[PDB]
Amino acid sequence: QVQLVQSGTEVKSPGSSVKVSCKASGYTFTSYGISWVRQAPGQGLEWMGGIIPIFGTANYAQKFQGRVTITADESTSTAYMELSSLRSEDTAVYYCARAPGYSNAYYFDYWGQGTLVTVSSDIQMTQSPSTLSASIGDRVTITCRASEGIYHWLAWYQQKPGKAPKLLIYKASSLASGAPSRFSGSGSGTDFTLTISSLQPDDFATYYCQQYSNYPLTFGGGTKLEIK
C-alpha cells in the first residue's frame, strides 16, 4: 500500500523552470529517501539526484551543474524536484522513487507514475543483449557489465511500456518484495546476470540494471525481451 503520486504534465519553453511534486503514502516518510530519475529515448534512464529528508541531505548528478533542486516536506510526506534553465534535451518522463535506505547512493523499491515534462569518468553500465526474442517456458539470461568493480551494489528493474519501473533484484542477488521467484540475480565485481527460469507471458518487458556503488548512479541501456 506504498504509493507515490506525482503531479501532472508540464509544458515548458526553454530557459524556464519546472517544479514536480511526489506525494508519498502507506509508510513512514522520514524512514526513507526520495530520488528522481528521468527517462527519454536516446539518454535512457538518468539519475537526477535524491534527498534523505530526516538528514535534509541532497545529492545531484554533476551533469546538471546545480540546475536541479530537490526538497521535501515531512509535514505533508511530499518531495519536489525543481529543474532550472530548461533545455530541449530536458524533455523526458520524470519519476520520483523511494530509496529504502539512509543514503542517496541506493536502489529504488517503489516508483511514481511519472510526469511528462516537455521543453520547446562515471561508471558505465553495458547491457547485453539489447533485444531478445524468446518463447514461454524458456530460460533467459541477461548481462550487465560495469566499467569498474561495484562489488554487489547492483539492482535489476522490469519496465512495461509507459509504466513505472519495478524492482526485481537488489544487492546483485536479493529478491525484491513481491517479485516472482523465477527471477534470480548473480554476479560480483564487474559482470552481472539476471536469469528468468520458465519465461511466463507477463515477463515480456524491458529490463535494466543500475549500480549504486558510487555517484553518479548509472543504469544500463536496457534489454527488451520479446515473444517468438
Side-chain angles (χ1 to χ4, degrees):
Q1 261 100 2
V2 169
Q3 282 199 334
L4 296 171
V5 177
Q6 290 179 238
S7 44
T9 304
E10 297 279 349
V11 182
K12 298 284 159 180
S13 175
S16 78
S17 114
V18 61
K19 184 155 176 185
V20 185
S21 72
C22 172
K23 166 68 176 180
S25 76
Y27 71 94
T28 306
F29 187 76
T30 53
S31 282
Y32 303 90
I34 291 289
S35 297
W36 292 83
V37 176
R38 76 176 182 192
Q39 190 179 29
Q43 335 269 79
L45 288 161
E46 270 191 278
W47 173 77
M48 305 297 92
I51 190 156
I52 304 297
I54 203 56
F55 293 134
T57 53
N59 291 273
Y60 309 103
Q62 203 256 68
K63 289 170 193 182
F64 299 101
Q65 294 283 327
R67 293 167 59 228
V68 55
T69 313
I70 295 160
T71 64
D73 192 9
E74 37 201 78
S75 163
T76 200
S77 293
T78 306
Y80 306 90
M81 180 215 68
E82 198 198 330
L83 187 65
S84 290
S85 308
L86 287 163
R87 306 183 209 162
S88 255
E89 25 285 289
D90 297 312
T91 297
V93 177
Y94 288 74
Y95 296 95
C96 71
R98 190 179 73 173
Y102 58 72
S103 182
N104 296 125
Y106 225 58
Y107 60 92
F108 318 110
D109 66 353
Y110 288 98
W111 293 66
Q113 79 286 15
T115 292
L116 176 69
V117 175
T118 64
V119 188
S120 224
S121 55
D122 326 307
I123 311 171
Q124 244 89 324
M125 303 306 297
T126 59
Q127 267 175 271
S128 175
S130 291
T131 60
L132 174 66
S133 281
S135 310
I136 305 150
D138 287 2
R139 209 92 340 181
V140 299
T141 294
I142 298 158
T143 301
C144 180
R145 196 158 281 99
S147 70
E148 65 171 83
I150 62 169
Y151 183 37
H152 56 26
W153 316 121
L154 183 108
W156 289 99
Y157 302 93
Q158 185 186 259
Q159 188 178 41
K160 293 267 168 70
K163 323 289 180 280
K166 160 190 182 190
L167 186 69
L168 301 169
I169 300 283
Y170 65 96
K171 206 179 113 234
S173 58
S174 304
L175 185 75
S177 183
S181 50
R182 64 182 176 275
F183 287 92
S184 61
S186 160
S188 217
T190 214
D191 281 30
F192 305 81
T193 79
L194 174 77
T195 296
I196 323 164
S197 43
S198 170
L199 200 65
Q200 286 308 94
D202 165 262
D203 304 333
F204 297 105
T206 307
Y207 292 93
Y208 294 97
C209 60
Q210 179 225 323
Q211 67 78 30
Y212 56 106
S213 166
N214 221 322
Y215 302 125
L217 305 182
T218 45
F219 294 82
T223 295
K224 186 187 181 179
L225 179 64
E226 284 165 320
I227 202 161
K228 195 187 171 196

